[PDB]
């Protein structure tokens, strides 16, 4: 049938492209500049359709002459939602990011890292004459790859989009798994710190070169940057400001957390990562007592990368994945009767508490009577199955 | 806020749930029994909710007294469809399977699977008195790990539902990558075969117990199989006819082999697994030359077990996966592009008959113009984008 024919066809250019589509970002060692180099492809959406692509080229140098690890080749990957503040009049850019590195299969800079570390970004601009500065602070949290932070047009008007300014706008703070720790060049350079420099060229229009210095200043991470973008038409996607903010329609900034909040509970030694040991010790408080045969098998069937644990980004994996209805449905009911440990069909706030303070939560009496309180629909003092769907959906 | 823990608390407790669904046939050696165990648990879904688990205890013996391989530890993953013969007034069953072997990183017998071989399944059965019989027959492609069979009662009414036999009615079937081909017990047993014998335990009733012969007689891989089911429960799930048949609402299985149809446009050899220097070859044919390097990078971020190569099921989910509107939109622009070589907008009979050829089909000029007449709605002899589109939706 030639509508058989279509499709099969179809199907195999489909195939090609969705296997080219490469989004990481590759790094590889610089030896002769004792840094790095890298190369990604961004794939901005236009308004109403179409993609413009920007081809990034980058090379990091350290700043200091103290040694740094220079690594084999791997890649970054990288989750990003760009938020607006609803309260916020000048024009500006709320954005909330995941960067682990992978690719490779199973100090003193690494140090610096280990906690939630404030961040103060400086870029001042020009593109084809339009001068322009932003401003942004925040935290990172290299633990989990994350950073959170808020930006500011300093002089008005953005002449660009700011999805054109993400990558320009520090990948020390990547989550570096344990066996490739030796591979992150970005944390090695740190304090004194290390110089990032891009080309990056917008497909049919300008481009940008940028050179940012990243470094602690005291306790906090600065990047400050010089950008200068030439050969952009004006009716372009860029400064015609033709290009999509936010990706329809990511999942909410709420719910990462929550889960987070979730992962914390596995994640018992807080290094970002759930062991066979971890998941074992959460499963046996709960009643459940698996062999180390069992946990690894469990956690091989979600270990994308194969290093033997689960990250963050591998966990919201996990439970962001499509469910059918009728194994939804069963979750839930399988849930309840985790809660509800005699069988007996209403969650008691013993019940409750015991559940809660297994999976390694602090809560009082009180604390667990409200959480009764907001679910019990028909005042028994008690969560019976109808009730607790209501609360999970 | 009572809301936000009732969340973080139900994500945690339905975490270990997905963990703890190990789907996977968990094979390993039984050195005293020259043969294989396995163990694995199903999960049949009951009409109108609740799930009912079947516990699996296999163990494989050979039949010959010839060498054979005792695996390392490793699993098979299955992907099974069960359907319905319109035509088919008989009690019956319809299925087709996928089983692929993993679980492991990177001669006579194998030799006998290399094609298409003719499947003979007999089974006679006895639950809790009731006797019955079922007649199945297909084929089987282990390069692809596939199965199709249709499978009768002869003995009319069958006396338990269709699902709890289909672990019961060919495991050397399943495609083991080259890097675990010394680990295919099953394989190795044949031509002269094995004894599969089971106990399936179904939670809160009875048990099957089961022994089987697989062996060639002459070119057809014969399964036969006793049955004997005690302890039934006359109104439980099983007697009482209380599963559901099918799983809504898998993919297609037209679907399946449009994109095995597509698949084999890359597997150049037939092997069963796209490398990087067949993705290059098509890249190549299309106008597109990626390094080595940038195809093994293509393939890694689709590559589920880390072999280095894209096997049918991998190939599947890849295709299978949700993209947002917004994404399929710009991929079949994308697509449009490819077929498009010269980019004035329309496909012409020379260009999608250049298409073909290189992804090598093999079509005539009159072929080619009906895949254009079912497409072209206006009449102007070629495919234009909104055309196109339609085609591909
Ligand atoms: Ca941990
Ligand atoms: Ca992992
Ligand atoms: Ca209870
Ligand atoms: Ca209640
Ligand atoms: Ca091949
Ligand atoms: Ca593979
Ligand atoms: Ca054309
Ligand atoms: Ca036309």
Excluded at 307 to 335: C, H, N, Q, V, Y
Aim: charged share 30%.
């Amino acid at each position: 049938s030639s509508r058989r024919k279509w499709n099969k066809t179809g199907h195999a250019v489909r195939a090609i492209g969705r296997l080219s589509s490469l989004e990481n970002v590759y790094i590889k060692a610089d030896k002769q500049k004792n840094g790095i180099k890298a190369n990604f492809k961004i794939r901005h959406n236009i308004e109403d359709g179409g993609v413009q692509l920007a081809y990034h080229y980058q090379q990091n140098t350290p700043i200091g002459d103290g040694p740094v690890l220079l690594p084999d080749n791997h890649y970054l990957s990288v989750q990003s939602k760009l938020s607006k503040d609803p309260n916020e009049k000048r024009d500006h850019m709320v954005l909330l990011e995941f960067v682990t590195a992978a690719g490779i299969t199973l100090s003193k800079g690494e140090e610096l890292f280990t906690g939630v570390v404030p961040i103060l970004v400086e870029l001042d601009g020009d593109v084809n004459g339009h001068k322009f500065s932003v401003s942004g602070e925040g935290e990172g949290d290299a633990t989990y790859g994350k950073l959170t932070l808020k930006f500011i047009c300093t002089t008005g008007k953005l002449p660009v989009p700011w999805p054109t300014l993400v990558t320009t706008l520090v990948q020390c703070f990547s989550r570096y798994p344990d066996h490739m720790k030796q591979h992150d060049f970005f944390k090695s350079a740190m304090p004194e710190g290390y110089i990032q420099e891009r080309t990056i060229f917008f497909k049919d229009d300008g481009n940008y070169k940028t050179r940012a210095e990243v470094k602690f200043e005291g306790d906090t991470l600065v990047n400050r940057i010089e950008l200068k973008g030439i050969d952009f038409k004006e009716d372009g996607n860029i400064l015609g400001h033709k290009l999509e903010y936010n990706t329809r329609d990511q999942l909410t900034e709420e719910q990462i957390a929550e889960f987070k909040e979730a992962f914390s509970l596995f994640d018992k030694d807080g290094d970002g990562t759930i062991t066979t040991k971890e998941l074992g010790t959460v499963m046996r408080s709960l009643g459940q007592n698996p062999t180390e045969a069992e946990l690894q098998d469990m956690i091989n069937e979600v270990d994308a990368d194969g290093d033997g644990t689960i990250d963050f980004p591998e966990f919201l994996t996990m439970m962001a994945r499509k469910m059918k209805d009728t194994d939804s449905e069963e979750e839930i009911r399988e849930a309840f009767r985790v809660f509800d440990k005699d069988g007996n069909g209403y969650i008691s706030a013993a019940e409750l508490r015991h559940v809660m303070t297994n999976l390694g939560e602090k809560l009082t009496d009180e604390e667990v009577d409200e959480m009764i309180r907001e679910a019990d629909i028909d005042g028994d003092g008690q969560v019976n199955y109808e009730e607790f769907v209501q609360m999970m959906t």
